[PDB]
Design an enzyme around this catalytic site. Structure first.
Site, mmCIF file in Angstrom:
data_model
loop_
_atom_site.group_PDB
_atom_site.id
_atom_site.type_symbol
_atom_site.label_atom_id
_atom_site.label_comp_id
_atom_site.label_asym_id
_atom_site.label_seq_id
_atom_site.Cartn_x
_atom_site.Cartn_y
_atom_site.Cartn_z
ATOM 1 N N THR C 94 47.885 41.875 28.582
ATOM 2 C CA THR C 94 48.367 41.422 27.198
ATOM 3 C C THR C 94 47.865 39.971 27.006
ATOM 4 O OG1 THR C 94 50.688 40.255 28.168
ATOM 5 C CG2 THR C 94 50.479 42.651 27.388
ATOM 6 N N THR C 95 47.290 39.356 28.381
ATOM 7 C CA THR C 95 46.736 38.284 28.388
ATOM 8 C C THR C 95 45.106 38.327 29.092
ATOM 9 O OG1 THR C 95 47.101 37.512 30.857
ATOM 10 C CG2 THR C 95 48.698 37.182 29.037
#
Lengths: 42, 527, 524, 54, 521
Positions: C94-95
């Protein structure tokens, strides 16, 4: 390597990046100033 | 690389962020503010504060334990909210040590900011504290002792723990008068929680010594006129029924007649339907009655025609308590006068309590639920008394649930510190300094206890480190004076489960808050 | 000619166009990517932030962080949208994907100042993504997962919990997640709907208490609190109607033209009540599962009938109870029979001791279909963190339903794909090698930020690991994720998804190709 | 930005076009005073002085 | 219980006052802690109301000079830095960071409810013992020319590590040395001249074998002279007003006025001939001169130099062997300045007059052809500091050991004293000793080395008795500076420690900060 100085200080990084970024900005601004076919500024 | 403000405004109004040590400084300033706000009150000689609202009648409540304190105040830094939430969690679990876990977390973060000021990788600290906490948990469980094999020793330990709890709050001032009394209440539990079954009554005036636990049960309602005034040996049936309007379950019905005589006939029919319902209930031949909902005027007059005692609308907790203490049933069907069990008691009569009236219920069938009478010079005294005694009841119930205890405050702490130090001898590398910082962080707690007492700290801590280093694991700071003594004879027994839970929760919260790298406030939700 | 209003309200009208617009894009996007740096993959930290209403929520689940921001610039909102897409696709990186996009646009802004049309850069990125995903699919190894072997899945989830605080216990969660997936999975359809699992958490307790219950949990107590509290194996029924007498859903005016009508109705009321009692008692089911509540008469009758029941039970929980019990839905006593009843394994009441909550669990002896996960922890922040982490884990397992859904991660994939990209790009004509090399650099960005986050001396770390994995070719030589030497990943075994990284690459490439094109701007 | 704050900037043929803008403008006004035959234009000062020129 | 202060007048009589003082002190300490060791990085003092005037500096003296504060303790420390820079030079950084560490110690101690007077007495005794120990270790030289020269080289080289000019240390330190040689043992500081001429490189700079002047010449003066007989004067020479007043010209015809004009021309010519009777080939005028004297001088044909500087003429009178005169009745009672050649030189884009082969070389002139004005300003600041240090080490020949050597020496001595001392003071002194240990530590922090390892090794070495042990800053090891050549001024470190001691004494003895109501602005 083992643990050690984590470099918990990174504010100097912000200042250095800010200054150098401003430097590229100002240098980029006048990149149309020199040349036997160069343009000038009024 | 770290830069998120120089290029352009990536935020709307009131939205900001802080990446570098500034974020850590903010969080730690908030945490230390919390700690000093709370560490000024920890210990059996801990201190007390006053919480005052901003306007609106200036809500006044005195309290020693920091739970409600962190509830009321408006904490600002996200770490501060995290701390108040760990406080609320520890509070709901058992209590009487919420202050302790808050102070311990804040002090851990103090050594944490120091060590990171010594430029240390946070993951290393996290792993070191995890291993150290595992070892400390193992050692403390090894130090845990079971009890309850007999009655006298176990009961004595219960008075011990009760009084020890009363030291942390103001109740210490009369703790004896509380202690044994409190014990009896927890005796009436007989293997079930829901402290709501225990009833507490406050009336301004009297005295703390005047307060006592009822030798029976109490109720607070009012009785009708055609009902009697003094009764004994009552048989009790509980109900939750609608007897105000006899609302028929079908909605849409309506009378379509023309002559008002039919209306008189149907109204007499309704009144006789209610009379036959009263006959259905009275067929059980009970001597006293309670209904969870309102006793209407016609039902009340029919009861007076019967001439027996009937108790009007009440709550769910009251009817549950009565069902417990008398062994009746909350009945809403009355075609079976003999297929129900009737509540039992011996004496029901009012007692004019000063400027108040409360009915006395002696000779109840079951002594499970109890009513506590509280009296005091100010209502704030009553509020904090109820808070503190609720905390004590929670701890007593928790130690009834598991009879695993340890030795008094700090001594168990200090031997865990000794074990962690012994590991520090075994711990090489950089994690060693982190975990020994962890160790002295633990050791800081009795220092704060001594400071709250008002006695020299360094001498006591060094001497008691010497004492616990020689294997004298039963000596410790004296509760009576600033001296050192065995608490086994002194009588300070510490509930193992509560504070092992406290240690685990503190470790978890500390590692969570230390895992931070970036605070980014969103907009303040422009009005 | 004097200037005149052509465009409506040119007074408050702001236009940007050309290379300066791209400069604004790149600077904002680099700032965001560098903002979201320190949570990379298997090892990182967590960023804490408060929203408008004053709620504390911290995680490395980067999509939540980006979603809960009142950002100003459009490209950042686009980043938030991309993060939400990737999270709803896999749930990891997600990052990682946003840092990769930031790296790609770093390369884009470098090559931009070299005077080349953005079409060239987008084409180079697209070709490089093609090559990278192709080799990433060549290098992933098929995992033969059956119903009796779970150790590879256990290590998969264990590695996935890296940089996620739930790695405290780090072991039991993998087992309970695998068991839950196995219990609830629809094998033939390869389908797992997460609405079948009631992901619940209650503050207090410890992360050791993180458990899977092979049944259902319900949060309503007895209608008669005095009634006996616990029952062993039982038979239940699910009635979708209250115990009130049947009144139609059409407006009805029941006249009462006589007193004997009054007697008839007051007799018929009870007659219906005890008739319902007899109906339900005949079928022999121990438990009744209703939705709309009912009257106290039913409560006392069941007290005299000793037949447990509950009320006001909500829709989805009603459905889940029905699913777990194996029976069917009984709208009304006409459908009521001993056949469609649901058999109970055992049902019990707890109150969490000190708490005043009440909560019934149903644990089944026979086969179940809907399981429940419970959480114990430090606060609501702990509860939500565990919830989101385990939910992402369930997404990982659902992706992992198939084989070859795993390749060695921990950054080693980044080195491998960067090497393949460089090798392919070198054998190309000009005007493309620059963009492809830029993509390659964006690829080894991930290990650099990884080593930074770990606090390891970065540049030497990547140099040595690259040399080791170049001289001898393997997909397992990544940098230290457990930071204890043994960089051969055939020992640490970072076991993470394939499609996760592939989707991250695809999303980043498409998104940077998109952003490269917005060259003329207009704001009010 | 370019570190030229507290001011305004412009570029492109646009400004070159704007360089036409004023210039061609001042042409039109004088567009009736040419050589042998032209028409005079009237000027009024703030004071109101009555003046003519060709 | 009643308001007693004026609007804007504040009094904090609790620990909040010391809290504010301490946080301000720490804000001071961290800002400067990056300007220490050979690893320091420079800072910017940016302005907005000063019409955007900036200065870059490394020696924190200017930093504390250009920043004010409301907390009076920070201003106290600013004045302390003022004093320190007034004494010798670099070390303001040292004393300020040391004060920060000692006040952090005080924080930790107050964290134990201790009456501060115990701390005060213990630190008094610790400082006495440390000064005694350092004096007992005071290493002295100057008995040999080569030894003393090498000691000065070591001091200068070590000092240039703390500032920027290290990049050409061999081309700078040694050069500075000869400058203080030209002082010839005189105590004057104001003989060295500082010259800034942007353009060129710091290595393009040099020390000329003479002197230079930057003033205009008269209307007709020769460009070059040899074996110049030099005289320096300070009189009117501006039509030489009579200095008498209350006297008026009051006639009835202008022929008398014409004769008065002719007479004043003659009198001025008489003054010129009075001067020329002594006989010179070069004249100096500290101030201006008029056209008629200029024509007379051109008739003489000598060098007349106009509008000089008071300090400069004092320097040049010291240099060339003459002294300033104002009356010229005595061609016999004056000593004349002497030089070999006086020529013209063009430096930067400015015109200078060159003294070559001067009869003496007392004063000094350091030309800096640097590359920016800000680097020029910081270069002149740094050379001022370095020459102050050079002059101080020439004054007192006793020297000491840096790299923490003397520092850990006093640290271990205080350690032993605390060990043989009972009571709180001991650990306080130990913490005090620990306080001192922070100073080299921060140095290593500037390098970013294995901190605790190095500190442990140094404490072990000093406990073993190796009294020359130090920190190798070239690689991050532990060695002997006697091999390396890291020596400093005994006076410098001595006064650093003493001033830090008294500053701590005064700061710790505060109890109530009261800020008066602001006047207005």
């Amino acid at each position: 390597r083992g643990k050690g100085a984590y470099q918990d200080r990174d504010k100097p990084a912000q200042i250095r990046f800010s200054n150098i970024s401003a430097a590229k900005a100002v240098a980029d601004a006048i990149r149309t100033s020199l040349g036997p076919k160069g343009m000038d500024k009024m | 690389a770290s830069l998120s403000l120089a290029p352009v405004n990536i935020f709307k109004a009131g939205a900001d962020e802080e990446r570098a040590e500034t974020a850590r400084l903010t969080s730690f300033i908030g945490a230390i503010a919390i700690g000093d706000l709370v560490k000024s009150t920890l210990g059996p000689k801990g201190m007390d504060k006053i919480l005052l609202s901003s306007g609106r009648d200036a809500s006044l409540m005195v309290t020693n334990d920091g739970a409600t304190i962190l509830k009321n105040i408006g904490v600002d830094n996200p770490a501060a909210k995290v701390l108040v939430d760990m406080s609320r969690v520890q509070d709901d679990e058992v209590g009487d040590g919420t202050t302790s876990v808050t102070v311990l977390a804040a002090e851990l973060l103090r050594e944490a900011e120091s060590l990171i000021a010594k430029k240390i990788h946070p993951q290393t600290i996290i792993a070191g504290w995890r291993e150290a906490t595992k070892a400390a948990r193992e050692a403390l469980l090894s130090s845990a002792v079971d009890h309850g094999s007999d009655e006298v020793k176990f009961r004595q330990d219960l008075m011990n723990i009760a009084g020890t709890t009363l030291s942390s709050k103001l109740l210490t001032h009369h703790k004896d008068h509380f202690t044994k009394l409190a014990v009896e209440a927890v005796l009436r539990l007989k293997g079930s929680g829901n402290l709501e079954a225990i009833h507490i009554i406050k009336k301004l005036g009297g005295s703390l010594a005047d307060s006592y636990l009822d030798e029976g049960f109490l109720l607070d309602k009012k009785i009708g006129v055609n009902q009697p005034k003094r009764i004994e040996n009552a048989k009790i049936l509980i109900a939750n029924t609608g007897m105000d309007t006899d609302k028929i379950k079908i909605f849409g019905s309506r009378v379509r007649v023309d002559s008002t005589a039919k209306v008189a006939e149907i109204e007499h029919a309704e009144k006789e339907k209610m009379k036959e319902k009263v006959e259905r209930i009275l067929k059980h031949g009970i001597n006293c009655f309670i209904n969870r909902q309102l006793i209407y005027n016609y039902p009340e007059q029919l009861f007076g025609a019967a001439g027996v005692m009937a108790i009007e609308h009440a709550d769910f907790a009251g009817v549950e308590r009565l069902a417990l203490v008398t062994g009746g049933e909350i009945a809403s069907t009355f075609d079976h006068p003999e297929l129900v069990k009737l509540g039992s008691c011996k004496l029901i009569e009012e007692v004019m309590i000063g400027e108040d009236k409360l009915i006395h219920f002696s000779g109840v069938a079951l002594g499970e639920a109890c009513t506590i009478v509280l009296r005091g010079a100010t209502q704030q005294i009553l509020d904090e008394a109820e808070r503190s005694l609720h905390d004590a009841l929670c701890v007593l119930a928790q130690t009834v649930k598991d009879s695993r205890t340890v030795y008094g405050g700090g001594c168990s702490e200090m031997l865990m510190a000794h074990a962690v130090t012994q590991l520090a001898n075994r711990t090489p590398g950089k994690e060693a300094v982190a975990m020994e910082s962890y160790a002295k962080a633990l050791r800081m707690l009795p220092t704060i206890i001594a400071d709250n007492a008002g006695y020299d700290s360094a001498d006591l801590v060094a001497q008691l480190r010497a004492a616990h280093s020689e294997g004298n694991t039963t000596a410790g700071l004296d509760m009576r004076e600033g001296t050192i003594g065995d608490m086994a004879i002194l009588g300070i027994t510490e509930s193992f489960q509560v504070k092992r839970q406290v240690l685990l929760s503190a470790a978890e919260a500390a590692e969570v808050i230390l895992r931070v790298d970036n605070i980014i406030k969103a907009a303040p939700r422009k009005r | 000619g004097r200037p005149f209003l052509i465009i409506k309200d040119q007074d408050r009208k702001s236009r940007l166009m050309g290379l300066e617009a791209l400069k604004s894009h790149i600077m904002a996007a680099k700032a965001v990517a560098n903002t979201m740096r320190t949570s990379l993959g298997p090892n990182g930290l967590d960023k804490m932030m408060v929203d408008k209403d004053g709620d504390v929520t911290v995680t490395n689940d980067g999509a939540t962080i980006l979603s809960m921001m009142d950002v100003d610039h459009q490209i950042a909102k686009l980043m938030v949208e991309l993060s939400k897409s990737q999270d709803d696709e896999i749930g990891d990186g997600t990052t990682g994907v946003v840092v990769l996009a930031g790296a790609l646009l770093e390369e884009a802004e470098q090559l931009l100042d070299r005077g080349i049309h953005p079409i060239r850069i987008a084409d180079g990125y697209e070709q490089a993504a093609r090559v990278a995903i192709e080799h990433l699919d060549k290098i992933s190894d098929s995992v033969l997962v059956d119903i009796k072997d779970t150790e590879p899945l256990i290590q998969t989830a264990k590695t996935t919990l890296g940089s996620k605080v739930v790695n405290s216990c780090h072991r039991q969660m993998a087992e309970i997640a695998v068991n839950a997936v196995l219990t609830v999975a629809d094998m033939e359809r390869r389908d797992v709907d997460f609405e079948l699992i009631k992901v619940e958490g209650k503050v207090g307790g410890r992360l050791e208490d993180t458990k899977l219950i092979k049944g259902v949990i319900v949060d309503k107590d007895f209608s008669h609190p005095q009634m006996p509290k616990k029952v062993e194996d039982a038979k239940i029924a699910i009635l979708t109607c209250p115990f009130e007498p049947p009144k139609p859903k059409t407006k009805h005016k029941l006249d009462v033209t006589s007193v004997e009508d009054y007697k008839a109705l007051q007799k018929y009321e009870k007659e219906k009540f005890e008739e319902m009692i007899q109906q339900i008692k005949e079928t022999g089911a121990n438990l009744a599962i209703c939705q709309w509540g009912f009257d106290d008469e039913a409560n006392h009758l069941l007290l005299q009938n000793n037949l447990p029941a509950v009320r006001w039970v909500g829709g989805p929980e009603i459905e889940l109870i029905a699913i777990a019990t194996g029976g069917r839905i009984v709208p009304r006593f006409s459908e009521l029979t001993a056949e469609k009843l649901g058999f109970a394994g055992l049902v019990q009441e707890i109150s969490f001791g000190t708490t005043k909550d009440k909560m019934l669990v149903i644990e089944q002896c026979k086969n179940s279909r809907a399981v429940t996960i419970f959480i114990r922890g430090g606060n609501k922040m702990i509860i939500e963190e565990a919830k989101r982490s385990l939910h992402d884990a369930l997404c990982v397992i659902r992706n992992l339903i198939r084989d070859n859904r795993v390749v060695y991660g921990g950054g080693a994939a980044e080195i491998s794909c960067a090497l393949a990209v460089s090798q392919e790009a070198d054998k190309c004509p000009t005007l493309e090698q620059y963009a492809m090399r830029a993509f390659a650099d964006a690829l080894e960005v991930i290990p650099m930020a990884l080593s930074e986050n770990s606090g390891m001396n970065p540049i030497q770390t990547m140099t040595e690991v690259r040399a080791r994995q170049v001289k001898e070719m393997n997909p397992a030589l990544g940098i230290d994720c457990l930071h204890k030497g043994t960089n051969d990943m055939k020992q640490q075994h970072v076991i993470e998804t394939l499609i996760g990284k592939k989707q991250q690459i695809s999303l980043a490439t498409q998104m940077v190709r998109m952003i490269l094109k917005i060259d003329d701007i207009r704001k009010p | 930005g370019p570190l030229s704050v507290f001011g305004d900037r412009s570029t492109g043929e646009t400004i070159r076009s704007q360089n036409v803008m004023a210039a061609a403008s001042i042409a039109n006004i004088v567009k009736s005073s040419l050589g042998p035959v032209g028409l005079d234009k009237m000027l009024v000062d703030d004071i109101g002085d009555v003046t003519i020129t060709n």
